[PDB]
Design a protein around this motif. Sequence first.
Motif, PDB file in Angstrom:
ATOM      1  N   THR A   1      15.007  21.298   3.513  1.00 26.23           N
ATOM      2  CA  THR A   1      15.608  22.497   4.249  1.00 26.23           C
ATOM      3  C   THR A   1      15.374  22.550   5.898  1.00 26.23           C
ATOM      4  N   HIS A   2      15.810  21.558   6.531  1.00 23.12           N
ATOM      5  CA  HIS A   2      15.414  21.347   7.699  1.00 23.12           C
ATOM      6  C   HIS A   2      15.643  22.695   8.831  1.00 23.12           C
ATOM      7  N   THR A   3      16.568  23.525   8.412  1.00 24.08           N
ATOM      8  CA  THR A   3      16.878  24.814   9.158  1.00 24.08           C
ATOM      9  C   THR A   3      16.118  25.746   9.161  1.00 24.08           C
ATOM     10  N   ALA A   4      14.876  25.611   8.227  1.00 26.73           N
ATOM     11  CA  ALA A   4      13.922  26.678   7.997  1.00 26.73           C
ATOM     12  C   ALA A   4      13.050  26.897   9.162  1.00 26.73           C
ATOM     13  N   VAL A   5      13.203  25.970   9.854  1.00 26.20           N
ATOM     14  CA  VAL A   5      12.474  25.754  11.546  1.00 26.20           C
ATOM     15  C   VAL A   5      13.659  25.641  12.362  1.00 26.20           C
ATOM     16  N   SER A   6      13.129  26.029  13.908  1.00 29.13           N
ATOM     17  CA  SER A   6      14.531  26.071  14.625  1.00 29.13           C
ATOM     18  C   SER A   6      14.692  24.689  15.254  1.00 29.13           C
ATOM     19  N   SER A   7      16.219  24.420  15.773  1.00 32.83           N
ATOM     20  CA  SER A   7      16.307  23.375  16.407  1.00 32.83           C
ATOM     21  C   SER A   7      15.394  22.862  17.470  1.00 32.83           C
ATOM     22  N   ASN A   8      14.619  23.758  18.250  1.00 31.52           N
ATOM     23  CA  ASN A   8      13.739  23.168  19.134  1.00 31.52           C
ATOM     24  C   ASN A   8      12.359  22.982  18.447  1.00 31.52           C
ATOM     25  N   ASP A   9      12.116  23.560  17.289  1.00 31.05           N
ATOM     26  CA  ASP A   9      11.081  23.145  16.549  1.00 31.05           C
ATOM     27  C   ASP A   9      11.007  21.884  15.898  1.00 31.05           C
ATOM     28  N   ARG A  10      12.183  21.374  15.664  1.00 35.02           N
ATOM     29  CA  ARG A  10      12.226  19.929  14.803  1.00 35.02           C
ATOM     30  C   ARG A  10      12.236  18.956  15.889  1.00 35.02           C
ATOM     31  N   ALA A  11      12.832  19.209  17.475  1.00 34.74           N
ATOM     32  CA  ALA A  11      12.562  18.241  18.526  1.00 34.74           C
ATOM     33  C   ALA A  11      11.093  18.099  18.452  1.00 34.74           C
ATOM     34  N   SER A  12      10.306  19.016  18.615  1.00 35.29           N
ATOM     35  CA  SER A  12       8.819  19.043  18.860  1.00 35.29           C
ATOM     36  C   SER A  12       8.168  18.172  17.903  1.00 35.29           C
ATOM     37  N   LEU A  13       8.829  18.226  16.468  1.00 36.32           N
ATOM     38  CA  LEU A  13       8.045  17.664  15.216  1.00 36.32           C
ATOM     39  C   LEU A  13       8.147  16.141  15.587  1.00 36.32           C
ATOM     40  N   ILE A  14       9.516  15.790  15.901  1.00 35.25           N
ATOM     41  CA  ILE A  14       9.937  14.419  16.423  1.00 35.25           C
ATOM     42  C   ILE A  14       8.919  13.903  17.422  1.00 35.25           C
ATOM     43  N   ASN A  15       9.001  14.644  18.456  1.00 36.03           N
ATOM     44  CA  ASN A  15       8.239  14.280  19.709  1.00 36.03           C
ATOM     45  C   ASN A  15       6.826  13.975  19.185  1.00 36.03           C
ATOM     46  N   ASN A  16       6.230  14.952  18.674  1.00 34.07           N
ATOM     47  CA  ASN A  16       4.836  15.050  18.638  1.00 34.07           C
ATOM     48  C   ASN A  16       4.384  13.816  17.451  1.00 34.07           C
ATOM     49  N   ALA A  17       5.310  13.928  16.411  1.00 36.87           N
ATOM     50  CA  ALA A  17       4.789  12.765  15.394  1.00 36.87           C
ATOM     51  C   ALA A  17       4.598  11.193  16.230  1.00 36.87           C
ATOM     52  N   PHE A  18       5.742  10.624  16.782  1.00 34.72           N
ATOM     53  CA  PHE A  18       5.813   9.451  17.592  1.00 34.72           C
ATOM     54  C   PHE A  18       4.777   9.480  18.879  1.00 34.72           C
ATOM     55  N   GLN A  19       4.356  10.465  19.447  1.00 30.04           N
ATOM     56  CA  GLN A  19       3.383  10.405  20.364  1.00 30.04           C
ATOM     57  C   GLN A  19       1.980  10.419  19.746  1.00 30.04           C
ATOM     58  N   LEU A  20       1.899  11.087  18.489  1.00 29.48           N
ATOM     59  CA  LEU A  20       0.727  10.853  17.819  1.00 29.48           C
ATOM     60  C   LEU A  20       0.570   9.319  17.167  1.00 29.48           C
ATOM     61  N   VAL A  21       1.398   8.867  17.113  1.00 29.39           N
ATOM     62  CA  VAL A  21       1.290   7.202  16.806  1.00 29.39           C
ATOM     63  C   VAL A  21       0.827   6.264  17.976  1.00 29.39           C
ATOM     64  N   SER A  22       1.285   6.507  19.490  1.00 28.98           N
ATOM     65  CA  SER A  22       0.879   5.962  20.458  1.00 28.98           C
ATOM     66  C   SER A  22      -0.586   6.222  20.799  1.00 28.98           C
ATOM     67  N   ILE A  23      -0.971   7.290  20.322  1.00 29.88           N
ATOM     68  CA  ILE A  23      -2.457   8.090  20.175  1.00 29.88           C
ATOM     69  C   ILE A  23      -3.303   7.291  19.263  1.00 29.88           C
ATOM     70  N   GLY A  24      -2.539   6.999  18.185  1.00 27.32           N
ATOM     71  CA  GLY A  24      -3.453   6.356  16.853  1.00 27.32           C
ATOM     72  C   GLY A  24      -4.087   7.526  15.962  1.00 27.32           C
ATOM     73  N   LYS A  25      -3.159   8.750  15.810  1.00 20.50           N
ATOM     74  CA  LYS A  25      -3.666   9.785  15.038  1.00 20.50           C
ATOM     75  C   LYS A  25      -2.705   9.816  13.814  1.00 20.50           C
ATOM     76  N   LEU A  26      -1.774   9.294  14.003  1.00 22.19           N
ATOM     77  CA  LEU A  26      -0.588   9.265  12.967  1.00 22.19           C
ATOM     78  C   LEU A  26      -0.004   7.788  12.756  1.00 22.19           C
ATOM     79  N   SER A  27       0.099   7.284  11.429  1.00 24.07           N
ATOM     80  CA  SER A  27       0.478   5.981  11.351  1.00 24.07           C
ATOM     81  C   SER A  27       2.170   5.958  11.928  1.00 24.07           C
ATOM     82  N   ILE A  28       2.716   4.711  12.353  1.00 22.86           N
ATOM     83  CA  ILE A  28       3.958   4.697  12.458  1.00 22.86           C
ATOM     84  C   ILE A  28       4.884   4.708  11.004  1.00 22.86           C
ATOM     85  N   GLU A  29       4.405   4.351  10.197  1.00 20.59           N
ATOM     86  CA  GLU A  29       5.080   4.628   8.759  1.00 20.59           C
ATOM     87  C   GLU A  29       5.449   5.958   8.520  1.00 20.59           C
TER      88      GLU A  29
END
Length: 408
Positions: free
Chosen positions: A89-117
């Motif tokens: 249910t993606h709409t359970a968080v706001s439109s801006n919240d989902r952009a943040s999740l996307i941004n933070n996940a991928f930046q956490l890959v460059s940082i090495g705390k989350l895998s690219i997978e």
Amino acid sequence: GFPLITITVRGRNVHMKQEHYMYLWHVPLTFITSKSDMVHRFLLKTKTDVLILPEEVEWIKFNVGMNGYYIVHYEDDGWDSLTGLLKGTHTAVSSNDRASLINNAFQLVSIGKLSIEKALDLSLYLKHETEIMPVFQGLNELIPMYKLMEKRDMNEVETQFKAFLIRLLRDLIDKQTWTDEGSVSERMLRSQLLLLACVHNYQPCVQRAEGYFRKWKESNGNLSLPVDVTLAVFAVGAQSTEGWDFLYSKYQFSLSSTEKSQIEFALCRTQNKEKLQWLLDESFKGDKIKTQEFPQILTLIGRNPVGYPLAWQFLRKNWNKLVQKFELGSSSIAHMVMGTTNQFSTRTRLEEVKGFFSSLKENSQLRCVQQTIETIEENIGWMDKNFDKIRVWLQSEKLERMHHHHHH
């Protein structure tokens, strides 16, 4: 850099950590959860602390009450919970919240705390996404990945990467009208979506684009095209010599600068190397195209998968003249140094760049040279770690859609 908040859930115990990534402050945190109604607040005054939830929860989502950039990291367990949430249910968080999740996940890959997978697994939720921000945030993370691949020997993964991208957005692309209706958002979503479809050769888009172009061209550009559709139409029109030349003719006679800018982009996207060289030569000269436009054009050709060696060559060969024209410490020069080199990702390229700029003496000291070298160095590191991973994740997800054990 910026604040990085790590959230760890242990039954009803929420552990919160603060660090400044790249010492301590009073971090104003807010959060909702899969049980919550409203937004709860917690002032994090120490390195780490714990709050207690009334009940165990399926997912938690934090924000920081601050202006500017920061990251919330939830670790492997929490990134899966949020992934399941976005896929359910993606709409359970706001439109801006989902952009943040996307941004933070991928930046956490460059940082090495989350895998690219895990980050790519998160990106799959986008197949249901409809709002401009998470979509454009998606594009902002994902495109740079194939810009890197375009400058290497990676045609197989690049094309699989690009088809993955188009698959995420295909339903949203098929929904768009080829008109100018809607809010500012919807028109911009439309316009950039249709373009993106055509750049990646999604046939229903490309063929509708080719039809509009033909009709526009046969009319001597007398028919009005919807504005939201014109970049896409221009970009596919410019793929042939006839259409490129036609489009070039109109650029000459046009008294509309948003047209001129649209056409400019389309001309730079051709695969024809002699046309690319011509655009560079003529813009540099300054009479068929303003030299004011040259840093922009160089940069756009620098990003064409086939013009990128022309742009870095031209900059190297003509350096003393570019300096006379624009001036050493100018924004134009910095823009040009960065747009011809910041998508390289091999040691060899890095030595080339260092070689060329260190050979200039008092013409070498520019901060943009240090900043491109940094970004290339990050590129090297990110590609050496992530390319094989992405390669295997893509082949493995194409296989799983063909057959997976849930198909039994």
